[PDB]
Amino acid sequence: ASEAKQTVHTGNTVLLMIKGKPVGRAQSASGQREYGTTGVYEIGSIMPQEHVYLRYEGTITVERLRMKKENFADLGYASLGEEILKKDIIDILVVDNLTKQVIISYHGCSANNYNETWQTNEIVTEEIEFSYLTASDKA
Amino acid sequence: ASEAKQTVHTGNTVLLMIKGKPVGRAQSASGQREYGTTGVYEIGSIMPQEHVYLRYEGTITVERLRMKKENFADLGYASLGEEILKKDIIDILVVDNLTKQVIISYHGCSANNYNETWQTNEIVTEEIEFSYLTASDKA
Amino acid sequence: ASEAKQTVHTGNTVLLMIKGKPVGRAQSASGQREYGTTGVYEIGSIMPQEHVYLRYEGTITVERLRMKKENFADLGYASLGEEILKKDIIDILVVDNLTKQVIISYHGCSANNYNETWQTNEIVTEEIEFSYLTASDKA
């Protein structure tokens, strides 16, 4: 029940941090990976003999409500036009809210798309999908 | 709660402006972008070494209820038939309603499609999807 | 509120007319267009330099309840079998109900498909999708 004693992580007890700054009013954070698992077959056997990991591919999508100040365009993590060419590699962390302990880290994220939506009588929302080099967890 | 003090943008407090004129009774404005993020691989390493931004692509979709006067065909921003060949590049802005301050701007939009729908016992609706050169935000 | 003073078009106050005859008990009329907007790129620049309108393509779909008399097959606008080869180009108009004023016109429609549905305890419905040369609005 209590935060210290619950056995399952929840969105309430997890912070999303970027460049050492917590992302305020993020809504979701989905992590996708693919190892390129290819099976090896032969003539003379129906089954796959073994599976080989050919290539690593990773994606993270962050959804966020458009903050008045400090949205991704103003805060400088997303960018528009040729400004992409000047934005260095960025690292995003997922941290426990209680102990500020890293749950996972996405080493070196870089954007794929930056999506925005204004709509009648609804909160403005934003979405970025990053590709990243590698993920890892420590401690 | 109040307009000046809320920390999140909403459709209530944002105006959609085109050619210096506010678009009356627009319903939604979706912004889509793609940086063409390609990963670089090698022989001798599973992971991507780096990501390169190959090409910039942008889209904006504006949905609007068919105004009696001054719809996009009559107002002169959309066009029908060969009239497309004569409509110059147009710029659309998204502005704060309160301070008339630019939130983002879509430099040089140009139409992809112009969609209309009449239906029984329902309000007539319109949709335009523009391609645009670049987006940016100032101040 | 009143018909003369409402600022938005609605299905109640719009007539659908074909060959000078109003289409009785039509249910919807969707207009689709594509300008073939292609962007121009280069070596030496990420962004699109300009957008060119390559080709114009248009479609209109009309949905209608199967009238006892004067359905599209009997009324002579749709056709079945080899009769397509003998049906000349037809023009469809969308007109204001009040002033009989043209809202838009679809110059020279020609059919793509003619779809019908009978179903248990439901009204019979019909659908035609036309290709057309050009659209325009006047007055």
Added chain:
Amino acid sequence: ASEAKQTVHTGNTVLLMIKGKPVGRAQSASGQREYGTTGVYEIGSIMPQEHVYLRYEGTITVERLRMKKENFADLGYASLGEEILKKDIIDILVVDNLTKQVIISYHGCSANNYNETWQTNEIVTEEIEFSYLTASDKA
């Protein structure tokens, strides 16, 4: 106090007439309508800009005690089984008892349901709910 001088209509001084015949021993007559009032909103404004009347819908319910003769099934206005397919559109009037002056008229009623109830030591009752095209009042 007197019938000629009272300022409010009452069930005592109103007759319910169908097809020119007064309905004997009717108990209630409820009239329901809906104009489909939809409000129009925008991005950039909290309030509704205007209300549009999308569709007209009407209902009348008549409750009646089961007359020995000339109930709705015998009198021929209600019907059972396939007989519905042969009952033409019927018009019901609400008339002043004194001057035989039309209060309102329900042009072209048609039945939705025909409900009956027998119960121990109670009067048998009947109920019909009609849909109708339009209502109006004259003189």
Added chain:
Amino acid sequence: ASEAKQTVHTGNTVLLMIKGKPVGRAQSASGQREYGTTGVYEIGSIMPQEHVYLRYEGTITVERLRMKKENFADLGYASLGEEILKKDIIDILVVDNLTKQVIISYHGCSANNYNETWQTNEIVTEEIEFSYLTASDKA
């Protein structure tokens, strides 16, 4: 006790006025509103961070006994059939009986439904539910 000195409004001391005319023998007037209060949440916090007013919606219901003359259909404020299309926006006021001072005003009401009931040995009653643009109070 006296009208001038009682601290609470009552139905005895309040008039209901429409188009400058007092509504005779009205029985009730209910005002309903909704601000569309939506709460803003995040990952990393259980509570709502703030509440935003998305959309304004208002309703007023007026119940009235069917006057012999000058009921809503005859008096011209309600309407039947296609006559709705021709009834302009109407304003209703709630006024103090003593000083003829506006308590509240419902700017620009428009009808949703018009309900009637005849019943045995009972007074005929009427009910209209209006949507309205905005409400306000002055002086």
Added chain:
Amino acid sequence: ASEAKQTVHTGNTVLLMIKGKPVGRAQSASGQREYGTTGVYEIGSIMPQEHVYLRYEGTITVERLRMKKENFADLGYASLGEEILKKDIIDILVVDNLTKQVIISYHGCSANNYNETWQTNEIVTEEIEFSYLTASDKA
């Protein structure tokens, strides 16, 4: 309202007939067509110059509940296995129930697929999709 006077066809008043026999307890009958409308373009003009009807293609789907006797397999219109090779071309008609008057006819249908479904606590259903040479209507 009545069958003779309603202006719209319905599933209640339409029979589905095959080989002169009415299909008992059919549920739906969908007719699909395509004229292969191709547009003609040029160098020197954005718009399509004309549309040509290249090829006629037609489909009809009939859905039916599995009759105990006289289902399509037993009745001999559908077939299983090599029996397809021996089933001659079949003609299906859609007829008015009242006057036994042909609404449309599908000259020479031939099956594409024969689909069946048994399910827990549900009625068994069948579906056939025919290709046909041509459709037409008479009288």
Added chain:
Amino acid sequence: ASEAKQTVHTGNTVLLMIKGKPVGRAQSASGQREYGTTGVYEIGSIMPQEHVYLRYEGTITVERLRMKKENFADLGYASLGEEILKKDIIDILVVDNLTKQVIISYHGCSANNYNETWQTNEIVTEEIEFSYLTASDKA
């Protein structure tokens, strides 16, 4: 029996205060909360393993008789039309009448709806339902 010695709170001995001002002639004050208690299940066990508090939601409803002066619209806590956009967050307290000691406090209430009712020969009543950030009690 006496106020100082009774062991149970009552409406007689509790004041309702808003912005430091006691609300005169309030009738009821209902407090509603929901912790979003979700149970955690598994494959391999029928029972819930634990319950997690996902989201906090709170509501307070205040019912009040329409004061002649200083009703919620005039007193400035409720508001009508666009005035909602300008009313800052408000705090409501529930206090002991005797010692002026806070029983509970509703930090930062904001309105959901503002309801009014005029009725024949009855006292006028008002109702507001607020959402609020958090509640707490001290001393």
Added chain:
Amino acid sequence: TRPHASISEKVFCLIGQAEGGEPNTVYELRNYSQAKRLFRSGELLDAIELAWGSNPNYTAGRILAMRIEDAKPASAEIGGLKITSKIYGNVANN
């Protein structure tokens, strides 16, 4: 041709030896075109543009400035007129 086209909350103060404009009066500044119009020369003109040119990203808001000098305007009495310069300082003699 009268209608035509032609071609931070932390407010910051500066005070010192400006060499232009009337002294002993506070001026509220927004752009250095306004500064050159009034503060022709001296350390204040450098200080204003330094405050607004202080950092590539950050800048000072509206600036409050006063010339602290005992300057007075050049003037002449000739003909039937007394002639006074609007400029304050030694330069007014020119």
Added chain:
Amino acid sequence: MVAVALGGLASGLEIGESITFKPLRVSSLDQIYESIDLDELNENGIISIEFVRNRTNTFFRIVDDVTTFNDKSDPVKAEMAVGEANDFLVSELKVQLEDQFIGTRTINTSASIIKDFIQSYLGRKKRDNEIQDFPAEDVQVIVEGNEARISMTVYPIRSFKKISVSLVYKQ
């Protein structure tokens, strides 16, 4: 006849839309006047036309809609479009007041009701964008006998007229 053409153009514009900078479609103008001369004419309230040869095109545009009335302090008198909007708005308000109140139903149509009717009318006109804004709280009505004396404020649509650019070359 140039004034004829200007009247034909102005009658074709939207109500309240200015002839300012609109094309005239005159062929050639027997023009003496340059920029300072145009200033002298326009400051005197005399409408002037300027020939403009664009980079690749020619057109004649009229600089302003200033009326012959000299004093610029009141744009209702000095400017024609403001006056036109004032005339149409006033006529509509007159008619609506006639229908609502000079039907003479009762003297009991107290001042607060008239204030409410005014505020609803100005709210509608703001919704139509026929007026920029009005004070919601600063309308007052005094009624005595059969007479009501009314005072109100309205903010007219504020037009935007002048720009100056200081282009600087560097590097």
